[PDB]
mmCIF file of C-alpha atoms and ligand atoms in Angstrom:
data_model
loop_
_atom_site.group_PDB
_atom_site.id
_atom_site.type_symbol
_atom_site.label_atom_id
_atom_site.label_comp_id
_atom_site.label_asym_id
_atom_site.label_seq_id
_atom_site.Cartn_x
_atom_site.Cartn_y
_atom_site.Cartn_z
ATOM 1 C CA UNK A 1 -129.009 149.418 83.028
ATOM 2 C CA UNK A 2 -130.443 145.894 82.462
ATOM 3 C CA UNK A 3 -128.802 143.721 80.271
ATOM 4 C CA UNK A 4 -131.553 141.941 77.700
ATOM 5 C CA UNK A 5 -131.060 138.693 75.871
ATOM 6 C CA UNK A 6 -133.865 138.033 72.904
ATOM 7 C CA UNK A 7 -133.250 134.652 71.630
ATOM 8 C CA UNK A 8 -135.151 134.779 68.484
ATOM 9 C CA UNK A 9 -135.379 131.963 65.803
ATOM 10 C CA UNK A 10 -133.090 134.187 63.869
ATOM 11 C CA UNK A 11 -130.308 134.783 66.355
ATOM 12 C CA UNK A 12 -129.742 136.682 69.796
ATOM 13 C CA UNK A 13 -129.852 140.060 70.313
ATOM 14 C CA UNK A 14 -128.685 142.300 73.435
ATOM 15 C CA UNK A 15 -129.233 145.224 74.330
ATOM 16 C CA UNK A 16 -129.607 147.716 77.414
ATOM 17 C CA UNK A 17 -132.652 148.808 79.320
ATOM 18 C CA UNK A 18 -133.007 151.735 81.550
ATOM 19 C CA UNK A 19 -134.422 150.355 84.870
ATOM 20 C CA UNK A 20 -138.416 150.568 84.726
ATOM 21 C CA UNK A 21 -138.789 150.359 80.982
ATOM 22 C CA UNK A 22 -140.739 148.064 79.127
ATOM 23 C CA UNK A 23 -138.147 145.824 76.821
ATOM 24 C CA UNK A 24 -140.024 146.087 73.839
ATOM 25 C CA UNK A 25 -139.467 149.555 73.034
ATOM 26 C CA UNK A 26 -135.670 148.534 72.032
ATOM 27 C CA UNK A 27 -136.134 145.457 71.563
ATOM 28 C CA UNK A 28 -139.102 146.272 68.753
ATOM 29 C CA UNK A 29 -136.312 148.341 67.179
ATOM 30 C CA UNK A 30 -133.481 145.581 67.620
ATOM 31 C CA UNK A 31 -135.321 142.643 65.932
ATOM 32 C CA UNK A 32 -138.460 142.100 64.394
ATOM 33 C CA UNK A 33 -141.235 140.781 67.264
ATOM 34 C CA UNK A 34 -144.193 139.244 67.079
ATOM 35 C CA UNK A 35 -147.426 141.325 68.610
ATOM 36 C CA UNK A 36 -151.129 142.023 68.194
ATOM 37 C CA UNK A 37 -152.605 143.507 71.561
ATOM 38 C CA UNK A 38 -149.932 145.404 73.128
ATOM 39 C CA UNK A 39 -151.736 145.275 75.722
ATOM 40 C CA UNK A 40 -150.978 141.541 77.604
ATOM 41 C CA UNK A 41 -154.269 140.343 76.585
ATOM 42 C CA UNK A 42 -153.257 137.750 73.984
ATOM 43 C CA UNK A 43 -150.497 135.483 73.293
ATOM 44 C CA UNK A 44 -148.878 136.493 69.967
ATOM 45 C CA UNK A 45 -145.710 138.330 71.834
ATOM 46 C CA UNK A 46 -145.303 135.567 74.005
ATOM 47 C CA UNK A 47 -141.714 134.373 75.278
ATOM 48 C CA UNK A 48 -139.558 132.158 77.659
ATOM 49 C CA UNK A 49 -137.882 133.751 80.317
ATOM 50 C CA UNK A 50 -134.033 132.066 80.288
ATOM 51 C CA UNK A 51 -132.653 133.378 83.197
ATOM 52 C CA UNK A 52 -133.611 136.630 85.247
ATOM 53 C CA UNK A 53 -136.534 138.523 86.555
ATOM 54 C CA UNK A 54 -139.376 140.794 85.327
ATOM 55 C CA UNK A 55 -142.601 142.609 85.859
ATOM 56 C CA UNK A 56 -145.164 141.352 83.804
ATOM 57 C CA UNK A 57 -148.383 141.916 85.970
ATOM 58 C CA UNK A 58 -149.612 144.328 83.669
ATOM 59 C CA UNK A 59 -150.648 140.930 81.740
ATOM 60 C CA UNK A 60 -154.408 139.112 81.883
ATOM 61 C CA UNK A 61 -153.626 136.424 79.667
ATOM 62 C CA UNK A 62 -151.335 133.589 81.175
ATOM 63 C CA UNK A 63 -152.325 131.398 83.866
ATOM 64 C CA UNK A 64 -150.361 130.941 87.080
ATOM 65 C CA UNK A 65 -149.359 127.559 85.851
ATOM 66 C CA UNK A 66 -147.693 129.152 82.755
ATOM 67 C CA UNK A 67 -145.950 132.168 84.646
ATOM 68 C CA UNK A 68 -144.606 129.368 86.979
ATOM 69 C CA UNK A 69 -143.242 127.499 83.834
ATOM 70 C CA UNK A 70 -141.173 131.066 82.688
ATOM 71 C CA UNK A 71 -143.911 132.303 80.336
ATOM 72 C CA UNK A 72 -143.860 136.180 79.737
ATOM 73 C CA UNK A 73 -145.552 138.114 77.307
ATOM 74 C CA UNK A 74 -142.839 140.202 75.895
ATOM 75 C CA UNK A 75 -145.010 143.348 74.755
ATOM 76 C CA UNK A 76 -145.334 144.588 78.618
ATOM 77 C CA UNK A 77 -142.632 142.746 80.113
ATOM 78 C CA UNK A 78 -140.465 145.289 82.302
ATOM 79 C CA UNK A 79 -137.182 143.856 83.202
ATOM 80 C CA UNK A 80 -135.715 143.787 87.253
ATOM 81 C CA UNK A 81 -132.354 141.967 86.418
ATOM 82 C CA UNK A 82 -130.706 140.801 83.298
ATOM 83 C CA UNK A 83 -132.734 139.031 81.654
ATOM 84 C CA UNK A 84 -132.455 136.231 78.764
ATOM 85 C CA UNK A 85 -135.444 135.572 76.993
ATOM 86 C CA UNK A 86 -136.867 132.779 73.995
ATOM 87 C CA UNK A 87 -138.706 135.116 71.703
ATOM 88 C CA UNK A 88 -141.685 133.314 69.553
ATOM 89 C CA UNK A 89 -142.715 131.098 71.612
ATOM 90 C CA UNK A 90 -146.548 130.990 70.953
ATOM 91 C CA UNK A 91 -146.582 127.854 69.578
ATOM 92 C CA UNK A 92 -145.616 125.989 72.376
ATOM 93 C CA UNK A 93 -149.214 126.698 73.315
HETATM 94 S S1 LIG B 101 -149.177 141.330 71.926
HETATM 95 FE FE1 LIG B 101 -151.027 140.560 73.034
HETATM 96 S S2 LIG B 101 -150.153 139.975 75.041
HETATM 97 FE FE2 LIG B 101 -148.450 140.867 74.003
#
């Protein structure tokens, strides 16, 4: 499984992902996220990736500039390595 980081303004959280699953599903359950869409159309989930790799091109909303920068919108993010992400990170908008 992947190994997921959320560093939220609250403290980190790990946890395990089966390999093609969304992250949000546990990590929803694991600490309380920030989201309005669902659907990678908005911002309000949004996140910086620390270190590792997903699939978020089910998103519409960032630019390239902003996925080059580590931006990932955590509500359809689908890990491919560990990952460590900065949850609540809309602000820095
Ligand atoms: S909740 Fe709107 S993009 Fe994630």
């Amino acid at each position: 499984a992947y190994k997921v980081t959320l560093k939220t303004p609250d403290g980190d959280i790990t946890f395990d992902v089966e390999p093609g699953e969304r992250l949000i599903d546990i990590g929803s359950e694991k600490a309380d996220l920030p989201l309005s869409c669902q659907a990678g159309a908005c911002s309000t989930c949004l996140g910086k990736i620390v270190s590792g790799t997903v699939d978020q091109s089910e998103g519409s909303f960032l630019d390239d500039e902003q996925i080059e920068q580590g931006y990932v919108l955590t509500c359809i993010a689908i890990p491919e390595s560990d990952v460590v992400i900065e949850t609540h990170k809309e602000d820095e908008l």
